[PDB]
Amino acid sequence: RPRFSFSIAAREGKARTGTIEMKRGVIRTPAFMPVGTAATVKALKPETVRATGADIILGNTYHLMLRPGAERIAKLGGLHSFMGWDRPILTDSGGYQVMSLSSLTKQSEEGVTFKSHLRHMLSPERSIEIQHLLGSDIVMAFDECTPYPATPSRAASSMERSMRWAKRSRDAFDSRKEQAENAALFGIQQGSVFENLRQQSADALAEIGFDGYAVGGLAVGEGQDEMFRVLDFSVPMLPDDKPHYLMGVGKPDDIVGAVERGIDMFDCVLPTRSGRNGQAFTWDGPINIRNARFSEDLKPLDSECHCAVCQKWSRAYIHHLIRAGEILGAMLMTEHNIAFYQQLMQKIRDSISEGRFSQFAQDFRARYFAR
Amino acid sequence: RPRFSFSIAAREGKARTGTIEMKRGVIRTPAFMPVGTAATVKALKPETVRATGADIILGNTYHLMLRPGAERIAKLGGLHSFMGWDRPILTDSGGYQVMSLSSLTKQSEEGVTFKSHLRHMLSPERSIEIQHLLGSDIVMAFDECTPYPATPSRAASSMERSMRWAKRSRDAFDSRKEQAENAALFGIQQGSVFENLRQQSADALAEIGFDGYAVGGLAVGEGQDEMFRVLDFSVPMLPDDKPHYLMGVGKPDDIVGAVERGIDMFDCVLPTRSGRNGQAFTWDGPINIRNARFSEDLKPLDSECHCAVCQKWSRAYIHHLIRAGEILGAMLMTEHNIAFYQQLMQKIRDSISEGRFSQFAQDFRARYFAR
Ligand SMILES: CN(C)c1ccc(C(=O)O)cn1
Ligand SMILES: CN(C)c1ccc(C(=O)O)cn1
Ligand SMILES: CN(C)c1ccc(C(=O)O)cn1
Ligand SMILES: CN(C)c1ccc(C(=O)O)cn1
Ligand SMILES: [Zn+2]
Ligand SMILES: [Zn+2]
Description:
Two copies of one chain form a homodimer.
Chain A lengths: L3 E9 L2 E8 L2 E5 L1 E3 L12 H6 L5 E3 L1 H6 L3 H6 L3 H5 L5 E3 L3 H7 L2 E4 L4 E4 L4 E3 L1 H11 L3 E3 L11 H24 L1 H6 L1 E6 L5 H14 L3 E4 L8 H11 L9 E3 L5 H8 L5 E3 L2 H7 L2 E2 L6 E2 L19 H5 L2 H9 L3 H27 L3 H14 L1
Parallel strand pairs in A: 4-14, 5-6, 6-10, 10-11, 11-12, 12-13, 13-14
Antiparallel strand pairs in A: 1-2, 2-3, 7-8, 8-9, 15-16
Helix pairs in contact in A: 6-7, 7-9, 12-15, 14-15, 15-16
The complex binds 6-(dimethylamino)pyridine-3-carboxylic acid (4 copies) and zinc ion (2 copies).
Cofactor (chains A, B): Zn(2+)
EC number (chains A, B): 2.4.2.29
Catalytic activity (chains A, B): 7-aminomethyl-7-carbaguanine + guanosine(34) in tRNA = 7-aminomethyl-7-carbaguanosine(34) in tRNA + guanine
C-alpha cells in the first residue's frame, strides 16, 4: 500500500473531498480525527471509535512522552499495538501542548525545556524521534504557536523560528529511513493574523516540502469571525495538491465554515470532553442532557442520528446516567458525539462530491442555529 | 414461558446445578448476578454484560426509588426498557440498604423512615410496590438485617419482625395480580449465628411460601469461617426444591465454598467496584494492575481467560489506563472481572453436572491461593 497518496475526487468553490491512502488505511476527507490524548479516545474502545466512522485518530505526544513514555511504548510494540487501533494515527508535535500544559518552560532556538504537571525537553529532533518511537503515521513538525494577540514583529520572529524548526523537523524525519518510508510529515504555517507573514510561512514550508500543511496559530482565542478571516487568505497560500489541516477545531459550524475555506482535516476535544460533561450535539444544536427538561424524554439524543446509542437509549436514561456520575453516561454521550461528528463529515463529503455543499451548509446552519 | 420454574439437573454433596426458567429468560445455577445499582452495571453496556455470560442482574431499590424514582421509571416503561436489559432483573428489598446508606433512620413495626444521602419511608408494602413499578422479575421481601454481633434476644426479636415483614411482603405481592403472575418472590432467612433462630426463621418462611430463599444476615463482618459455619446448618433448613440465594457474596473462594454448602445464587459489588479500583481477578489470585510490576507486561490480565479484554489488551496497557484515571481502564477491568466471575460460575456448573465439583474446588483453591 502507498505511504501517502492524496487524491481529490471533487471540488466546490474552495471545498474539496477526496482520500488519503496510507499503509494502515484510507482517510476520507474532509476528515474529523477523534482525540486520543493518553493512548485512548476517552470512554471508547477502538472498535467503537471505528464503528462511528473514524478513519484516523490523534495521539498527544506531550502526554505520551511523559506517561507511559515513548521508549516504553516502543518497547511494547508501538502505539497502535499498545492501544489496539490498527488504522492511521496522527501525532501532534508537542510544540503547542508544551506551552499550554507545562507548569514552567524555558524557550530557546534549540527547543523548549519544561516541567511536567505530573524537567523535560522538546525540540524538532526530539519531537520527531518521539513520534518515531510511537510509530505514528502522520508526524507533525515541531512548531511554536504564536500567542494571540501578538505584535507584527513578535509574530514575525516567532514564525521565522517555527520555519527553522520545520526545516529541522524535515531533516530529522528524512534521516530515519523507516520513518520516511512508512509515515508522512506535515508542516505548520504560522504568522498570526498577518497576511504577509502567513505568505512568507507558506513559501518557506513549500520550499522545504511537506506531505500536508496545517494552518497553525488559530483557535487560540481569536473567535470564529477572525479565524475565518485568516483562513480566507491563508489556505490559498498552501499547496493545493496536499491536505490542509486545522488543529483544535471545532464546533460543527466551525468545521463547515473551515471546509468552505479549503480545510481537509480537523481534530478537536469538544465531542469527547463535552460529551463527558453532558453536552450532546444534535442537528438542532447542542443540548445539555442534564437539564431537567430531558428527565422524561423518551426520544434518543437525536432522532435522525444513525449511531448505536440513538438506536437503543433515551435522553431520559442518559440524563439519569450523567446526573448520577455513571461511567456509562460518559460512554454513551461520547459515542454519540463522535458518531455525530462523523455523520457531519460524511454529509460534507457527500455534498461536495454531489456539487451541493453550498446548499448543505446553508441548510445545516439554518437548522443548527434554530435550536 | 413460565413465570418461575426451578429444575435441578445434577447434585454433588450439597451442591446443585440447574436452571430457573422465567418469562424474560433462563438463569443457569449456580448463578452470579452483576450488580446494576443505579440502573447500570457500572462501566458496561447491557450487551457487554450479556456477552460475559450473565443471565440476570441486580437492581438497587433504595437507590432507584430516590433517583430517578420508581414512578418515573414506571412512566418510562419500566427498568428493563429504561436501561436496555431485556433479561431477568432481581431487585433488592431495600431493608439492608436503608440501614447501610441512610444518614438517619427511625425503625418501627411499620417499616423504616429515613433521610437520603442525596425524608422517605420503606415498608413491606412500599418495597413491594416500588419493585412492582420497576418491573423486576425477582422481588425480594422487605427484611431487617440483624447487625453483627447481636445478643440472642435481639437477634430473636429482629428475626421475628423480619418474618412478620415477610408475610406482609407475600400478601402485598399476591394482591397485585400482574406482579404475582409475572414475577417471583423470595424470602430472607434471619437469625444471626443462632441455629435455633435460623430454624424458626426457615420454618416461618416455608409456612408463608416463597419461590426462593435467601440466607440473610451474612457478609456483615463475621468473616468467611463463621459465614461458612452458619451456612453449614442454615441452608439445609430451607426448602430443597427452591433456589437458595446468598446476598453480597463474594470473593471467588467465598462463592466456591458457599456452593459446596448449597447456595445457588449470588450477587456482589466486588468485580465491578474492585475492577474500577485496579484489582483484577485471575485464576492465580487477584492482582493490582496499578502495581509497577505490570508496566511492561504484555500478557493479558489472565492468560486463560476467554473474555474480549484478554483477547485484545495487555496488562501494560490497562496498567497505564488505570494509573491515568482513564474511563477505558475502568471499562476493561470491569468487563474482565465480570467475565471472570461468569467463567467461574460456568466451571462450577460444569463440574457439578459432571460429578467432579469436589476436585474442581480443591484444584481451584490450590491455584488461586498459590498466587
Ligand atoms: C528523544 N526522546 C525519546 C525523548 C526526548 C525527551 C524526553 C523528555 O524530556 O522526557 C523524552 N524522550
Ligand atoms: C487549539 N490547538 C489544539 C492548537 C492550536 C494551534 C496549534 C499550533 O499552532 O501548533 C496547535 N494546536
Ligand atoms: C410506594 N412508592 C412508590 C414509594 C414509597 C416511598 C417512597 C419514598 O419514601 O420516597 C417512594 N415511592
Ligand atoms: C452484604 N449484603 C449486600 C447484604 C447482607 C445481608 C442482607 C440482608 O440480610 O437483607 C442484605 N444484603
Ligand atoms: Zn446518536
Ligand atoms: Zn479476561
